[PDB]
Amino acid sequence: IEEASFLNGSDVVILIDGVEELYMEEIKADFEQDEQSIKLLGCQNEISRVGTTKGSFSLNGYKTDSKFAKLGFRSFEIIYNLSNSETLGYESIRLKNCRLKKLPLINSKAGEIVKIEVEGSFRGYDLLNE
Amino acid sequence: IEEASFLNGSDVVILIDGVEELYMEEIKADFEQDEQSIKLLGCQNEISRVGTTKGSFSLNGYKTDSKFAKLGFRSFEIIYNLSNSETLGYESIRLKNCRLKKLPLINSKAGEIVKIEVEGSFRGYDLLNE
Amino acid sequence: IEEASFLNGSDVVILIDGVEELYMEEIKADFEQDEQSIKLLGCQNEISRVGTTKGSFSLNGYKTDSKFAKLGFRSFEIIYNLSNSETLGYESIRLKNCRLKKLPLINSKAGEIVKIEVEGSFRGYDLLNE
Amino acid sequence: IEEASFLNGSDVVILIDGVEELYMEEIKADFEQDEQSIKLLGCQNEISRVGTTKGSFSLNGYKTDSKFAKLGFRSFEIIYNLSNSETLGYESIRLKNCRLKKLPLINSKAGEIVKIEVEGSFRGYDLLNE
Amino acid sequence: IEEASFLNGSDVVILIDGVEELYMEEIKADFEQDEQSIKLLGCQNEISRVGTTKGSFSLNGYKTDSKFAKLGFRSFEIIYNLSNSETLGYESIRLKNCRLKKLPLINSKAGEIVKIEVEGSFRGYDLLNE
Amino acid sequence: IEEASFLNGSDVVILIDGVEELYMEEIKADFEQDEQSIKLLGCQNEISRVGTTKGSFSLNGYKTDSKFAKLGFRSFEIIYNLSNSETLGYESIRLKNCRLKKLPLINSKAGEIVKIEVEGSFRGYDLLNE
Amino acid sequence: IEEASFLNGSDVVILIDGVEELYMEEIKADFEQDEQSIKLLGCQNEISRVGTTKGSFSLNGYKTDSKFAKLGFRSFEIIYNLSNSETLGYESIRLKNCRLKKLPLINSKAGEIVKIEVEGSFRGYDLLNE
Amino acid sequence: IEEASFLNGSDVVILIDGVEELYMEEIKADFEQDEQSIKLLGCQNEISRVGTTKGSFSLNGYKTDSKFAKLGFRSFEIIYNLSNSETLGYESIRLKNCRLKKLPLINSKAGEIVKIEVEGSFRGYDLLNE
Amino acid sequence: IEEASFLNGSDVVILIDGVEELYMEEIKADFEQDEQSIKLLGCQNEISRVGTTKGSFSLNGYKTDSKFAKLGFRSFEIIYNLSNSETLGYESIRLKNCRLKKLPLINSKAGEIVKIEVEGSFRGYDLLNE
Amino acid sequence: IEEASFLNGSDVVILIDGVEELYMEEIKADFEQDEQSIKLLGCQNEISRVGTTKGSFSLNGYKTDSKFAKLGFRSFEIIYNLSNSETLGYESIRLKNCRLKKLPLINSKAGEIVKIEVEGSFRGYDLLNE
Amino acid sequence: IEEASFLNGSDVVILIDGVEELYMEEIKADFEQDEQSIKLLGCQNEISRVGTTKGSFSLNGYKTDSKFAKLGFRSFEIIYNLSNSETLGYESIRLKNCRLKKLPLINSKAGEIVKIEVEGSFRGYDLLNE
Amino acid sequence: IEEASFLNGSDVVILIDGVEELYMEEIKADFEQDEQSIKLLGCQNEISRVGTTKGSFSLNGYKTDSKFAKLGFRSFEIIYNLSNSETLGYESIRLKNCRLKKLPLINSKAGEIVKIEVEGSFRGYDLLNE
């Protein structure tokens, strides 16, 4: 019903190691189970339990510097804020111990704008606001 | 033949842990066998038997809050009601011990509406109505 | 050459456990070998032999009831009749000991008609008519 | 250069067990190596040798009878003739000991013409003409 | 060369103490030498001679009764018939004084079909047919 | 032939010292001969005779208490019931004087569910039902 | 039935000589019989009796110090606590007079994290809690 | 910059076993490493070394004869010449010990021109011109 | 915000072994972890650590010479410069010990411009400028 | 270098007691030393001398008759010929006084082709051709 | 918890007889008890005591010289240093009187990098640093 | 560090009794101690001393002749040369008094290339070059 509840991608600000990142196209982050399946002798359905949690992120954008190449495989943090405009509420998520799986050293095509895409893993998250 | 028997997606109401969810785009739920294949010496076709049953659900929608991030990996229930309008009949399905496989912490694109997609597993189901 | 030999999907009637199913979109059924490959020392080509036979079916349609959810994983039969109109001939195939691999508990999208898709296995077949 | 050398699909006649098949859409047949790779200590490139040969065919068409369902998994032959019209030359290939991998018992969609698709294996081939 | 000479496991019927066993998965039987090695002073290769013969069988299947638990360690016979279908020939082997080495009292896993596996010894064999 | 004769692991209930055990994954029990081999001077095959009988069991499951650690090396009984559902028949086996070979004091891995596995010996068995 | 009864490896804390060990991957401990087999003249089954008890442990983890190399072959204790979260119950086991069979002086591979694995024996155990 | 440096597919002539092939649509040939990855204890990046070299080719065209069916799995050579027109330079590559992986016995569709596609392996190459 | 920060593919110059490459369509280079996953007994999330680093590049272009065929599998370097025009800044990346995984001997289609595509691995990188 | 020197398994013909065996999958034969180790007082390396020679063979194939069951433990001969096709040379080896260690009375699985595997010993060998 | 405590294999430097070894893949070293088991008349558990200590090492790497073949069976020392990078701490272990059990004279495969693997024994160890 | 130090299997040439062997896949040779363990009354660690040295080799390849069958159990020599290409250095090892443990008379499988594998012992070695 309420039009105002929907949140657009334009209400997004990303901070990589405390400095705002402006030239990003999309971002993803998931906190995934290693779900443990259990089968019992007296019971005829599988029982699922929570396993170890791992974080995975991807982060696609437009290249304007060699920030990620300098950044290397050092650990960093990602603070992601998604705000509402019609309402004043906002969500803020801090991904901790983020680390790149691979360095986007070179990615260019003949007549397109140079884009940068990275992926990696993070240990845990803090839901700062909501 | 009968036009009235068909059921549209618009006749759908979803309850996550007893509170209605309004900003959902699609939902899926399957109760899958671990079917056991049997081959016998005197017989020339495979015999299939029912194994342990597992439930899997997926649930795609539009982000309006951090409900699933707060929800974490705790167990919850999903009550799914699909009603007919031309007829007064309706189906109601309760998925029990539902648990998320991964947390949709961040999912945003440059100029699109922020969407949320989750998947998980459930133990069993109750066919409340039909 | 002969236009009349072709058979359209519209000349199809499906019986699930003896009661006609009217709201189906497509149906598939295959009877597959576990073909055994043989290599011999004196011979330079593989010899293939018939192994155990397994049946697999899929059955896509439009949801009008909770028939398959009630049906569960019980064994049922499928009688498939494909008739000719310009000619009076018809084929009838009976799939025996049919059993669902998974239950289509929930499948709905935002603005589409609710569809139901199931798959399973069957032991053998009877070619009743042809 | 020469327009006449090209061969169209329309110049095709297929014989299944000696009786012509008229309602076929496409046909495939390959005679595949189990190629053996050899690495030697003194040499820096792989040596390839001929292994056992296996035949595989596929055969898609339009359903007009239960020929393949009756045919079951019995061995049969396929004689494939591809003729030239502008020239009088023609090729004829006989696939021997052909055997179906699976039976196309049922394949129908809501408003489409009923099609039949089969696949299988054959032992060897005779290049009757060319 | 001849496809018909090969014998499939599906052409197998097993009789335990004169009553047919239908739920068996595989069977083995060997008649083993206690081969005697001889070394001679004037000769530079070992001479091998036939020693006492012992029979050993194994018999894996699916549990449908407590037949083997009741059977205990009593002596029984196994008649094994392997028939050809394309040809009318068949082999029949009678294992005599068969006796179980161990009783399969309990063998069950969480979500699998209950299987039974036994092993034992037999004195001699009669090649009834061939 | 008969689908109903097969018995699944889900139809299993285990009683350790008269109290039901619910969190078990698999169970095994064998009653093994100390088979005596006999060679005779006039005869050219080995004669096998029944020796002393020993029982061995293994019992794998999921840890929910320190039941087996408290149980120590005291003697206990195991009653194993395997029931049929499609048929009403059932088997019941009582293992007597069961005793653990080793105590599963500690068994845990980094991110897996804590499992418990025990093995032991039993004197004799009673086939209560069948 | 009860989801809460299962215990995950994540609810584990290990104390080596009173100081907590944080970088462990898995732990094992068994208290094994030297079971004595008895055969009697009038009786046709083996009688089993409890022999001397020995403890054996293994302890795999990630190397962060030379703790075990300094520890040498001195006697130490292991206190193992496995707690429940959904329930407040917990088990605590104290292994006494633990002693290493071998010292893990060096264990490293080319591109993997340095792991440490030890095994040893203990005299007895105290089941502190449960 | 220079328009003349580009080479079109039209400047291509292919020789199969010394006789020109005119009805080809595309050709591919690669000489692939079995690259050996090395990880060292003192070093934090992988070292790559050249392994055994294998050649793979594919060759798609239009069917005008049974050349490849007669050719079988015999070894043959492929000489590939790519010429420049605006410049007089040209490249010539000779693939040696070329051998088909599979025979394109039959490939025809309902109303399309009969095409032939083959793949195979070659030992080495000679860069005759450039 | 700033239009000038974006970098187009047209501001790219590539040097293969010190000589400029003009007829390239796109280039890629990544420096990938062999990320090591760690699970601990007391902790409920995976710990990720940096493993050995490997470089992978791909390099697609238009064929104007047999440079890569002559180059073979020898080691070479790639210097990649991406310059800004509105700003005077530029990035320069030197890939070291670059080596081809496969040689693009032949790649041509019927009526298209002859293209060349290569892939390979490199040991490390130097970020010369930025 | 020379492709023609390699010998495939397809160029194999086996004669058991003078009659060709066609349904064999693999064959092995070794002539093994009972090597005598010598240590001397003045010398610091072991001296090895030739002991008595024994032959061992294994012979795996597909069952088409009860040939080996009738053959029993009687002595027989094996003539093994391995021919070259590209060259006209061939090897022929005659194993003498071959005798089975065990009789393959029964070997069948649920849905697989019945295979026969035998092993035994032979006294000596004649290298008839080469 | 602490990411920095983990030690990677890349922080490893090995000295064989005082000269650094760079081309090693993995190393192992254990200092093993000849543990003495004691059983007493009044006591019902085994008593374990420390026996003589023996050292065993293994050392796998890549061959670049005949160092170990020249080294023969002479006694040598191994100094193993494992350093931390995020922290400045390091461990150093000196294995004394190391001696090879066997000489890796030849170890090569068809298309793989030549590797060298050795094993041996050492008398004692000095924990130089930690 | 240095790429050139690594030695590939392709830089290998083997001489059996002075004539080069070209069709070999891998080779092994070890010179093993009969290490003598010493325990002393006043000392708490084992003392290890060099015992008699024995050589063992294995040599796997592809069959192209009956060289090893003719060779029998006669003594022969193996000269193994492993060369560097980027550097001009090379290793040469001469194994003396090599003698086969068993003769590879027959080794063939259904559709694989005939391989030959031998093992044996040698007295001593000469490190000719390095």
Residue numbers in the entry:
A (entry chain h), B (entry chain i), C (entry chain j), D (entry chain e), E (entry chain X), F (entry chain W), ...: 7 to 136
Recite the paper's sentences.
The tail is attached to the neck and made up of a stack of 57 nested hexameric tail protein rings, with an inner ring of the tail tube protein gp56 and an outer ring of the tail sheath protein gp55. Each ring is offset from those above and below such that the extended tail assembly can be described as a six-stranded helix, with a twist of 19°, a rise of 39 Å, and an outer diameter of 230 Å. However, a notable feature is that the tail is considerably longer (225 nm) than those of other phages whose structures have been described. However, gp56 lacks both the ɑ-loop and the N-loop seen in other myovirus tail tube proteins, as well as the C-terminal loops seen in siphovirus tail tube proteins. The tail tube–proximal domain I contains a loop consisting of residues 368–378, which is twice as long in φCD508 than in the sheath domains of pyocins, AFP, and PVC (six residues and three residues, respectively). Domains I and II reside in strong density, but domain III lacks density because of flexibility in the region.
Here, we reveal the extended and contracted atomic structures of an intact contractile-tailed phage (φCD508) that binds to and penetrates the protective S-layer of the Gram-positive human pathogen Clostridioides difficile. The virion can be divided into five distinct regions: the head, neck, tail, baseplate, and needle. Structures of purified φCD508 virions in both extended and contracted conformations were determined by single-particle EM of frozen-hydrated samples; the resolution ranged from 2.6 to 4.0 Å for the extended phage, and 2.9 to 4.2 Å for the contracted form.
